[PDB]
Amino acid sequence: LPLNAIEPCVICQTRPKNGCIVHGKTGHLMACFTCAKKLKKRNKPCPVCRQPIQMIVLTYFP
Amino acid sequence: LPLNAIEPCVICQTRPKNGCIVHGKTGHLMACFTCAKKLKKRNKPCPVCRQPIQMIVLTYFP
Ligand SMILES: [Cl-]
Ligand SMILES: [Cl-]
Ligand SMILES: [Cl-]
Ligand SMILES: [Zn+2]
Ligand SMILES: [Zn+2]
Ligand SMILES: [Zn+2]
Ligand SMILES: [Zn+2]
Numbered sequence A, B: 001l002p003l004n005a006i007e008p009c010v011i012c013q014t015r016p017k018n019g020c021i022v023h024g025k026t027g028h029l030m031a032c033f034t035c036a037k038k039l040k041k042r043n044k045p046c047p048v049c050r051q052p053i054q055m056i057v058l059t060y061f062p
Helices: A033-041 B033-042
Strands: A019-023 A027-029 A056-061 B020-023 B027-030 B055-060
Touching: A019 A033, A019 B055, A033 A056, A056 B020, B020 B033, B027 B033, B033 B055
Parallel strands: A027 B055, A056 B027
Antiparallel strands: A019 A027, A019 A056, B020 B027, B020 B055
16 A cells, blocks of 8 residues: 555645646656646656656545 | 545455546546456446546556
């Protein structure tokens, strides 16, 4: 089970990990929506795998 | 912060929550990839919001 999912965004260290960086059928979830959207807007790659960012998904945990 | 992110798949109660159900620019992450992919294969809606499932994203937590 992913025990690190409850830690804050690794970029701003303030908001929760709710900005999923999607590339193909995988995603890296380590940033908040705010931070992740700035990377997409700036045409930056995924911070952990450097693949292109297809979209940011605002991720809820029901 | 999403303290329920580290609980198991609400469907199979055995695998981790790594199957993000994506609809538009939002996602609900409460199931594993295995369970979520069965819903997408059967064209079932999102279990919590009933929107159509565009894709399942295999979600990693770096
Ligand atoms: Cl945010
Ligand atoms: Cl986007
Ligand atoms: Cl899919
Ligand atoms: Zn952030
Ligand atoms: Zn990535
Ligand atoms: Zn499951
Ligand atoms: Zn949903």
